Each structure stands twice: as structure tokens, then as C-alpha cells.
């Protein structure tokens, strides 16, 4: 019963975090000396908020399914977390590949952005597993409720 | 009940915004000194309106499902928003990669187009989450109506 | 009731437009000085008619579903429009990438073909949204008919 | 009732056309001066017959579904035509990209093969839309028969 | 009734043909002067037998479905043939691309292997369409049996 | 009955292992002399934990399905293991390709990270097959219970 | 009835074979003079065991479906074999492409690893078709049992 309010709050945390990420990216892109670096940090910030919106949408999808079937919601949440993790790995590999292809003069700035981007990946991964763990935590109660019902 | 009219209006905002985006792109491509830049800004404008049409189609798909099942519509809207966000990230990465590969002489103009394109991504992302938030806002009423019905 | 005849006419417009596009492409490829340019304009014309046939097939698929369920037809039409828009963006990005990779001597001719190709993309996009808008316009009547039926 | 015989004949036209295409490709590859050109024309001929077999298989799939549901057959035929068109565009883009990457000495021969390949694409596209138009032509009779049945 | 025995025999022809293909590839790779050529001919032979096994598996899948529904088996066989043709085109394009990228000294040997590989593609394509034609040939009897049953 | 507790413990092992992997990666990235190497080891550590989270999510998905159908859970677990193995191979090939493309000066450090990454792949593969073997081990009991039930 | 025990034994053969493959790969990577070669042989061994685990999982999936429907199990086994063959071809093409891109000094060692990898592909292909042939062999008994039942 308390899941649905938790899911709404979790989306607020994600949306607020995404606003901070783009604010920081805009600050770095405000006066970056390299136009190529300006696009890179802007794309990294745009990629970060895009996956954050996808994570919020995935959480909302699980919440929508929670009102009909709890077993299906857990499966849907697990599928959404796996899809989010795979997409997060996709952008990390592209960012790492771009950083390796960057020139040594710009690679110093690109690696710092890559480290900041890696922090965003870690924050997204930590939030996803924590939300998934809480989501499956109620499944313990859902299965226990079924066990109590048959008693 | 007020969702369906809201969805129709939201499509009008998207279509009107897409017309402005292509109008601005046509102005920049009207007399651009570099033929390669002409294709780049035209493709960026064509990409922007293409995703805008996809976002409008995704909103209409959720509206169509809203007339049958509200829970399915919310799931469909969340899936459409995630698909739109993933596609938006795809074009942003391609645009950023092209900007990094652009020559320094053209990179100054390419980065300005990239910044304009990034603004379109931000506008699309902001509109998608706002529309999704309003769409799930009625789900609060939909669940409350079910709770009131069982009372 | 008037949708099905409209869909048949819309396919005739698309097929007639595709014939004009390939006729113009054949005229440019008839005596182009560069063999590489000959393949490029021919491929661009072949790509344009291919998506036009796909758009006509997508419209026919919606018309076929219109005879069974109107809600499903609108969803299918929206899905087909999104798929057509995504495919149209795919060829535009490839054409833009090829134009940027073209040599400066040929880039002048390639950019003109790219601009012509961009016009085909705009014509296809404008036709798709107009057809989709008319298709969902009947959904207003379909929902109104259901509302009148329950009265 | 006359569709099924038409589909069988249409496959015979496609198979006979594919035999002519590979016969012409074998003639050009019989004594081509460039071993790279020999592989290119052979692959182009192999690609042409491969899609021709796929088009024949797609037509047979629609014929198989025609014996159970006419509405499903039209949808399946439209889906098969779209898939064939997308695959045809895929090989055209690859052939065009290879032609642009060919050396100027071989590009003269490669462009002639590209033009011949483009003719095969046009023949396949024209046959697919003509077969699809005939397939949906019976849908007019199928819907009219249902209208006559309810009268 | 005679289909199932035919399918078993057809797999035996494919497996026997695959053994001959790898035997010939092993003979060429036994004493090839170029280590790069050794990997290329081995991969081409490995690719040929891999698709041959896939074709045999696709034929067995149609045979398995033949014991339950004949209409579904024909659709499954058509889908398997299309998938096999698409995969066969995929390896042909990769082999052709590798041959074009081969050095002129090795391209003479690579083109001969490409021609041998093209023969394997033709043999696989000819066998697939012949097996599919026989498979749909019984569909004529299956539909005729239904027509005779209703008489 | 003891599966569900085993699945919860297995996730704890995976999450604890992932924390150790990122801790080791952070130690190597804390003072790496090459900024490109810093991104590479960070991406490798981020990739390792991402697949570990996916493996934990896949295990939880099988546990969720275990409460409804045991046969479906085994199929879902097998599908999840195959998907995890395919994704693990994807990152291994990318890491191996990047290591081969690394310069000889950095390749010495890159190969050591590749060997460490290969150990993570082996640990993930060993854990996945061991968890799958235990999961199918209960299927022996599930089938035996059905056999005992019919007795 | 004897299939299920055969499937369990077949997995034991695959797992034991995979252990031998990685043991041999570890021996070659223990003292390889080239760090790039060390990653290549390790990745090839990791790829080999990964597909072996996938093949074992595919066999277990067919065994799980064998307890419910024999016709579905044969279709699932055929689909799994086709997927395994396609994935096996994917790694073979990547390995062959990497071998061709290897420098001549390392290509001698890379080709030997490629030949060893090709042997693993042949062993996997031979085991898959043999297991599939045995799996469909019981389908002969399954269909014969149905024929005997109706007698």
C-alpha cells in the first residue's frame, strides 16, 4: 500500500537529480574553451537526464502494474531495471570510446567529464538497485500475505 | 475525461513547435556558406521534427488506449516516453559525434547548431515528462475513483 | 465510412508522387558527370520511392484494421507513422553523413541532391502527419458515435 | 478465389526473373578483368535473387493466410511488402556506399553494375506494389461480399 | 503424409553437403601459404556449415509444426526460409566486403574463395526454395483435402 | 521452498562482489598515469557492476516466476542466463577490440585490465551456471513431486 | 522418458568440455609474449565457454518444455539451435575479421588461435546437431505413440 507513494517520491528524487545534472553540465558548457568539448559535455548531460527520465518512466510502469498484479509488477520492474542497466552500459561504452579517441590536449578535459559521467552512471545504478530492492521487498510481504490468507 | 482534449492540444503545441524549428533551420540553411553545413542543419531540423512527430504519435497512442483501459494507457505512455527518450539520445550522440569529427573551421558553426539541437532535445524532454506527469496525474484520479467505487 | 476511399486515394497520391521523384532522379542520373554521383542520386531516388511504398503499405495496413476495430486502427496507424518517421530519419542521417564525407568538388552536387532529398523527407513527413491527422479525425467521430449510442 | 492461382503465377514470374538476373550476372562475372569486380557483380546478383526468393516467400505467406482470414492476409501482405522494401533499401545503401568507396578506375564498372542493380530494385519494387495492389484489390471484393452478406 | 519422410531425407542431403563443404575448405586450408587466407577459408567453410545446420533446423521446425497445423507449418516454413535468406545475404555481404578490402596479392585467392562461397550460397538458396516449393506443394493437397471434405 | 531464500542470498553475493569490483577499479583509477587508462578501467568496472546488477535482476525475475509456475521459472531462468551470457560476450569482445587498438605503451596496462576484466567474466559465468544448475536442480524435485502426486 | 536423463548428461559433457577449453586457453595465455595476444586468446576462450553455457541453457530449456508439450519442445529446441548457430557464426566472423586485421608478426599466432577457435566452433556445431537429432528422434516416437494411441 505504501509502494505507490514511494514510487511517486522516487520519481521526484530522479527528476530533481536530473535538474542538478543538467545545471552542472550547463555550467561547464557555459564557457568551455573547446567547441567540441561543449558538445561533448552537453551530450553527456543530455544523455544523463534522458536515462533518468527513462528510469522514472520505468518506475512508473512498475507502479501502474502494481495496481493490478504484484507478481507481474515485480517481473516488469526487473525487466525495466535490466533494460535501464543495458542502456546505461551502452552510453558508458560510447563515452569511453569517445574519450579514448579524443586528442591528448582535450583528453584531459574529456576524462574529467567521463569521470563525472561515470559518477552519474553509478548514481543511476545505485538508485535503480535500491528502488528494485524496495520493490521486491514488498513482494516478500505480498507472498507472506498470500501465505497468511491460506492459513 | 479532460485528458483526451489535453492530448489533442498537446499535439497542436508539438506540431506548432516543429514548424518553428524547421522554419529556423530553413533560415540558417538558406544562405549557409558551407554546403556540408547546409546538409547538417537541414538534417538536424529534419531529425527534430521527425522525433516531434513521433512524440505526437506516441501521445495519440496513449490517448487511444485511454478510452479502453487507464492502467494500460499509463504503461503505454511510459513505454512511449522511454522509447522517445532513447531515440532522442540516439540523435544527440550522433550529432555530438559529428560535431567532434567536424573540422575546426566548421566546428564553430557546427557547435552552434549542436547547441540549438541540444535546446530542441531539452524542449522535447521537458514536454515529454510534463505530458507524462499530467498523464499519470489522472492515474491518481483513476485509482481514487476505483477506491471511491469500492466504498 | 469515407475513410476507406480516402486511404485508397492517398495511396494514389503517394504512388504518383513516387513516380515523379524517380523520374526526376533518372533525369539527373541520365548525364551526371561523376559515376559516384550517379549512384548517389539513384540510391536517393530509390530510397525515396522505397519509403513511399512503405508509407502506402502502412496506410493500407491501417485501412485493413479499420474494418475490424477503429481503436486498433488508430494505434496501428500511429505505430506505422512512428516507424515511417524513424526510417525516414535513418536515411536522412545516412545521406547527411555521406554528404559530409563527399569531396569538396563533388560536395556541391551532393548537397544539392541532399537538399532535394530533404524536400522528399519533408513531403513524406507532411503527408504522413496529414494522413494521420485525418485518420485520428474520424476517431473523434468514432468516439462521438459511441457516446451517441449510449445516449 | 482467383487470388491463389495468381499468387502461384506471380512466384513463377519472380523465379524466372531471378534466373535471368543471375544469368546476366554470371555473364559479366565470366570474364571481368578485376577480381574485386567479379565478387561485386556476383554478390549483387546473389543479393538480387535472395530478395526475389524472399519476395516469393512473402507472397506465399500471404497466400497461406488467405485461406484462413482475408483481413489477416492483407495485413500480413502489407507487413511482408514493408519488410521487403526495407531490406531492398538496405542492399541499395550498401551497394551505393561500396560504389562511392570504389576506386575511380573501377568506379566506372562499379557504377554500371550499380545502375543494373538499381534496375533490379525498381523491378522488385514495381512487382511488389503491383502484387500488393492486386492483393488489396480482392479486399475490396472481400469487404463487398461481407456487405452483400449482411444485406 | 509423405512430407515428414521427405523432410528427414532433406536434412540428410544438407548434412552430407555440409560435410563435403568443410572437407573442401579443410583441403584448401591444409597448406595455404597465407595465414590470413587460412582463417578466411576456414571461416567461410564454418559459416557455410553453420547456415546449413540452421537450414536443417528450420526444415525440422516446419516438420514439427506440420504434425499439428498445416497452415501454421507453411507460414513457419516461409518465415524460416526468409530468415535463412536474410542470414545468407548477411554473410555474402561480409565476404564481399572482406574480399574488396583484401590486398591485391591475396585478392586473387580471396576472390576464388568468394566464388566458391557464392556457389555455396547458390546451392543453399536453390535447396531452400526447392524445399519450400515442395512444402507448399502439399498445401495444395491440404487445401484440396479440405475442399473434398466439405463436399 | 528453499529456492526463494537461496535467490535472495545469491543476490547478496552478487551485490557484495560488485562492490569489491568497483572498489578495486577505483583504486586503479585513483592514481593511473594515463587519463585514457583512467576512463578504460572505470568503464570496465562500471560494465562489470552493470552486468552484475542485470544478473541479480535476472535471478529475481526467475524467483518472481517461481511463485506462480516452476516450469515457466526454469524457462525464464534459462532465457535470462542466455541473455546474460550474450551480453557478457558483447563487453568482452569490445574490451578485447579496444585492447588490440591500444598503443603498445598503454597496451601493457590495458592487457592487465583486460585480464582482470576476463576474471570478472569468468566469475560472472561461473556464478550464473552454478545458480542455474541449482535452479534446475529443484526442477528435478518439482517433476518428482508431480510424479509422486500422480502415484 | 529417456530424453530428460540424456539432456542432463549432455550438459555435463558441455560443461566438462568448456572447462577443458578454458584450461587450454589459460595455458596459452599464461606466458604469451604479446599482451595483445594474451587478451585475444583469453577472449576466445571466454567466448567459447560463454556459447557453451548458452548451448547448455538452450538444451535445458528444451528439456523443461519437454515435460509439458513434445511438439513445442522440438520447436523450441530448433529455435535454440538456430540461435546458437547464428551466435556461433557471429563470433567466428569477428574472430576472422580480427585475425585479418592482426599484424603479420602476430598473425601467425593469431591464425593458430583462430584455427583452435574454429575447432571449438566445429565441436559446438557437431554437438548441437547431434543433440538436436536425438531430440527430434524422440519426436518420431512421440508421433508414433500418438498413431498407436488412435489405433
Of B75, B86, B115, the CB nearest to A61: B75
Of D39, D50, D68, the CB nearest to E99: D39
Chain B positions in Cβ-Cβ contact with residue A47 (cut-off 8 Å) = 89, 92-93
Q: Which three cell numbers stand for residue E44?
A: 567461410
Chain G positions in Cβ-Cβ contact with residue E64 (cut-off 8 Å) = 71, 74-75, 78, 136, 139
State whether residue B91 sits within 8 Å of chain C by CB: yes
- Inter-chain residue contact C46 with D132, CB threshold 8 Å: no
Q: Which three cell numbers stand for residue C135?
A: 485518420
Q: How far is C130 from chain B (nearest CA, A)?
A: 11
Chain F positions in Cβ-Cβ contact with residue G22 (cut-off 8 Å) = 122
Residues in chain E: 151
Of G42, G50, G60, the CB nearest to F89: G50
Range of the domain at B115: 3-150
- Inter-chain residue contact C54 with D86, CB threshold 8 Å: yes
Alpha helices in G102-150 (DSSP H): 104-150
State whether residue D137 sits within 8 Å of chain C by CB: no
Alpha helices in chain C (DSSP H): 3-30, 35-66, 70-101, 104-150
Residue partners of E132: CB distance under 8 A and separation at least 6: D57, D60, E77, E78, E81
- Identify from A96, A104, A134, A149 which residue to disrupt to test chain F contact, counting F C-beta atoms within 10 A and taking the largest count: A96
State whether residue B119 sits within 8 Å of chain A by CB: no
Q: Do chains G and F touch (3 or more CB pairs under 8 A)?
A: yes
Q: How far is B127 from chain C (nearest CA, A)?
A: 18
- Minimal CA–CA distance to D109: which of D23, D6, D35? D35
Q: Which three cell numbers stand for residue D150?
A: 449482411
- Minimal CA–CA distance to B132: which of E22, A11, C85? A11
Of B35, B56, B68, the CB nearest to C107: B35
Using the Cα atoms of residue D40, residue D46, residue D50 and residue D53 in order, give the sign of their dihedral: positive
Of F35, F43, F98, the CB nearest to A92: F43
Closest residue of G to E36, CA-based? G100
Closest residue of A to B78, CA-based? A57
Chain C positions in Cβ-Cβ contact with residue D73 (cut-off 8 Å) = none
Residue partners of B135: CB distance under 8 A and separation at least 6: B3, B62, B73, B74, B77
- Minimal CA–CA distance to C13: which of C124, C102, C108, C90? C124
Distances (CA, A) of G56 to A3, F10, F79: 39, 21, 11
Q: Which three cell numbers stand for residue G44?
A: 576466445
Using the Cα atoms of residue A91, residue A95, residue A97 and residue A101 in order, give the sign of their dihedral: positive
Alpha helices in chain E (DSSP H): 3-30, 35-66, 70-101, 104-150
Contact B142, B70 (CB under 8 A): yes
Chain F positions in Cβ-Cβ contact with residue G64 (cut-off 8 Å) = 71, 74-75, 78, 136, 139
- Minimal CA–CA distance to F127: which of F5, F43, F9? F9
Distance CA E81, CA A32 (A): 55
Distances (CA, A) of A111 to A95, A96, B94, F23, F42: 9, 9, 20, 19, 10
Distances (CA, A) of C145 to B63, C70, F100: 17, 12, 66
Q: What is the DSSP letter of A151?
A: -
Of E22, E42, E54, the CB nearest to G86: E54
Using the Cα atoms of residue C89, residue C95, residue C101 and residue C107 in order, give the sign of their dihedral: negative
Instruction: Report the 10 Å Cβ neighbour count for E40.
Output: 30
Contact A137, A145 (CB under 8 A): no
State whether residue F69 sits within 8 Å of chain A by CB: no
Distance CA A121, CA A131 (A): 15
- Inter-chain residue contact G82 with E54, CB threshold 8 Å: yes
Closest residue of G to F125, CA-based? G50
Q: Do chains A and F touch (3 or more CB pairs under 8 A)?
A: yes
State whether residue A12 sits within 8 Å of chain B by CB: no
State whether residue E99 sits within 8 Å of chain D by CB: yes
Residue partners of G99: CB distance under 8 A and separation at least 6: E35, E36, E39, G107, G110, G111, G114
Residue partners of G75: CB distance under 8 A and separation at least 6: E61, E64, E65
Q: How far is B73 from chain A (nearest CA, A)?
A: 9
- Inter-chain residue contact F39 with A121, CB threshold 8 Å: no
State whether residue E48 sits within 8 Å of chain D by CB: no
- Inter-chain residue contact A118 with F42, CB threshold 8 Å: yes
- Minimal CA–CA distance to C1: which of C141, C127, C128? C141
Closest residue of C to D114, CA-based? C39
Contact B114, B96 (CB under 8 A): yes
Chain C positions in Cβ-Cβ contact with residue D93 (cut-off 8 Å) = 43, 47, 91, 94
Cα–chain center distance at F7: 14
The residue assigned the cell 501521445 is B59
- Minimal CA–CA distance to A116: which of A40, A65, A56? A40
State whether residue G61 sits within 8 Å of chain E by CB: no
Range list of β-strands (E), B43-147 = none
What does the longest C-alpha to C-alpha distance in chain F come to?
70
Number of domains in chain D: 1
- Identify from F94, F96, F98 which residue to disrupt to test chain G contact, counting G C-beta atoms within 10 A and taking the largest count: F96
State whether residue A79 sits within 8 Å of chain F by CB: yes
Closest residue of C to D135, CA-based? C60
Chain C positions in Cβ-Cβ contact with residue D97 (cut-off 8 Å) = 98
Q: What is the DSSP string of D94-107?
A: HHHHHHHHS-HHHH
- Identify from F73, F105, F118 which residue to disrupt to test chain G contact, counting G C-beta atoms within 10 A and taking the largest count: F118
Distance CA B24, CA B31 (A): 12
Contact C48, C18 (CB under 8 A): yes
Contact E55, E88 (CB under 8 A): no
Distance CA F39, CA D127 (A): 53
Q: How far is A128 from chain B (nearest CA, A)?
A: 15
**Which subunits count as partners of chain E given 3+ CB pairs below 8 Å?**
D, G
- Identify from B64, B72, B114, B124 which residue to disrupt to test chain C contact, counting C C-beta atoms within 10 A and taking the largest count: B64
- Minimal CA–CA distance to E119: which of E90, E83, E82, E92? E92
State whether residue F115 sits within 8 Å of chain G by CB: yes
- Identify from D21, D26, D64 which residue to disrupt to test chain E contact, counting E C-beta atoms within 10 A and taking the largest count: D64
The residue assigned the cell 529534419 is B46
Distance CA A136, CA F15 (A): 15
Burial of F150 (0-12, 13-18, 19+ CB in 10 A): exposed
- Inter-chain residue contact E65 with G88, CB threshold 8 Å: no
This entry's atomic model was obtained through: cryo-EM
Residues in chain B: 151
What does the longest C-alpha to C-alpha distance in chain E come to?
70
Closest residue of G to F101, CA-based? G36
Q: How far is F129 from chain G (nearest CA, A)?
A: 7
Chain A positions in Cβ-Cβ contact with residue B102 (cut-off 8 Å) = 36
**Which subunits count as partners of chain C given 3+ CB pairs below 8 Å?**
B, D
Chain A positions in Cβ-Cβ contact with residue B78 (cut-off 8 Å) = 57-58, 60-61, 64
List Cβ<8 Å contacts ≥24 apart for F11-19. F11/F56, F11/F59, F11/F60, F13/F127, F14/F52, F14/F53, F14/F55, F14/F56, F14/F59, F14/F127, F15/A129, F15/F52, F15/F53, F15/F56, F17/F52, F17/F123, F17/F127, F18/F48, F18/F49, F18/F52, F18/F53
Contact A51, A91 (CB under 8 A): yes
Amino acid at each position: 500500500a505504501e509502494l505507490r507513494e514511494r514510487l511517486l517520491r522516487a520519481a521526484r528524487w530522479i527528476l530533481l537529480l536530473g535538474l542538478l545534472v543538467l545545471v552542472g553540465f550547463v555550467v561547464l558548457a557555459y564557457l568551455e574553451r573547446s567547441p567540441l568539448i561543449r558538445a561533448f559535455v552537453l551530450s553527456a548531460g543530455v544523455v544523463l537526464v534522458a536515462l533518468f527520465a527513462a528510469a522514472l518512466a520505468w518506475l512508473y510502469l512498475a507502479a501502474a502494474l502494481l495496481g493490478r498484479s504484484p507478481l507481474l509488477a515485480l517481473v516488469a520492474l526487473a525487466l525495466g531495471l535490466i533494460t535501464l542497466a543495458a542502456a546505461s552500459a551502452a552510453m558508458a561504452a560510447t563515452f569511453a570510446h569517445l574519450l579514448l579517441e579524443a586528442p591528448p590536449e582535450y583528453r584531459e578535459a574529456m576524462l574529467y567529464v567521463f569521470g563525472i559521467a561515470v559518477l552519474i552512471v553509478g548514481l543511476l545504478l545505485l538508485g535503480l538497485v535500491w528502488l528494485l530492492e524496495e520493490a521486491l521487498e514488498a513482494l516478500l510481504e505480498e507472498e507472506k500475505r498470500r501465505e497468511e490468507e491460506e492459513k
